[PDB]
């Protein structure tokens, strides 16, 4: 039923037309915490804020910002951190996040270099002797291990709160073949990425939600709540095929702007869903 949608929508080529149609749709709510004098340097990109409503707050006490926010799916029974690729000068307050918000995952969905341009911060250590340590959060990050495969990585990093030395397993779930442009030609490695994520058990509701960015933290990781999201409410809802990818997108966006940056993907994520779908 989704995939007759689809035929349909590829058969009429109206792609970028349902995409300009969810730009007008979508919520708009203010970004003042954002758009304040001192969070200037916080922002990788001036024109992608998280909302006051959602955003992320952190605890220690001089400055609560972070341009990271949280999607609450409420049907769908499960809550992400959508956030940007860190700066040289907010990794701290990333692992803070991390930290503060006991998520137990990490999605990365670019690699740090593409096409010549940096996209986040090393934000984690490549070399097992080489930790690193935040010393305007207090924590310390260690690579324990990694596993390198052909589409993706996953490294167990230990992260210690070095003011009370507790230390948790975060896993780094880094999908490093995503197209220098465009969207994957097959969904197969990305949905297979997915479902390794879900697999770890990083995303159980016992845990904090997972975080997941790329360099903006609202097009490859739209692409990756949308498709995760529209997967559960599949598996939950008396008929699957009710699931409305567009009005899911709708309800994303009330909590981040921007989510899904191009009609290709839109038209990827539909893809996405309907081979994943089939999968479960
Ligand atoms: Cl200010
Ligand atoms: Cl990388
Ligand atoms: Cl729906
Ligand atoms: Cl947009």
Known sequence: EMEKEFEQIDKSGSWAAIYQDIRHEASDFPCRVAKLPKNKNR??????????????????????????????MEEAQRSYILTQGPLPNTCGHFWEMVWEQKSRGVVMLNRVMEKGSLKCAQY????????????????????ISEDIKSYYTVRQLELENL?????????????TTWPDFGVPE??????????????????????????????????????????????????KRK??????????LLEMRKFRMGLIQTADQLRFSYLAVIEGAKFI
């Not at 009370?164 to 780094?172: K, V």
């Not at 008929?239 to 899911?248: G, M």
Request: hydrophobic residues 35%; contains cysteine; glycine residues 4%.
């Open 43 to 72: 922002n990788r990109y001036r024109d992608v804020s998280p909302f006051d409503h959602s955003r992320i707050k952190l605890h220690q006490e001089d400055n609560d910002y972070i341009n990271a926010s949280l999607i609450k």
């Open 186 to 235: 097959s969904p197969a490695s990305f949905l297979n990425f997915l479902f390794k994520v879900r697999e770890s058990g990083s995303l159980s509701p016992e845990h904090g939600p997972v975080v997941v960015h790329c360099s903006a933290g609202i097009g490859r990781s739209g692409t990756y709540c949308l498709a995760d999201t529209c997967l559960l409410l599949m598996d």
């Open 124 to 143: 984690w250590p490549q070399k097992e002797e080489k930790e690193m340590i935040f010393e305007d959060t207090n924590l310390k990050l260690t690579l």
């Open 239 to 248: 008929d699957p095929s009710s699931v409305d990818i567009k009005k899911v």
């Open 163 to 175: 003011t009370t030395q507790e230390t948790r397993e975060i896993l780094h779930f880094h999908y």
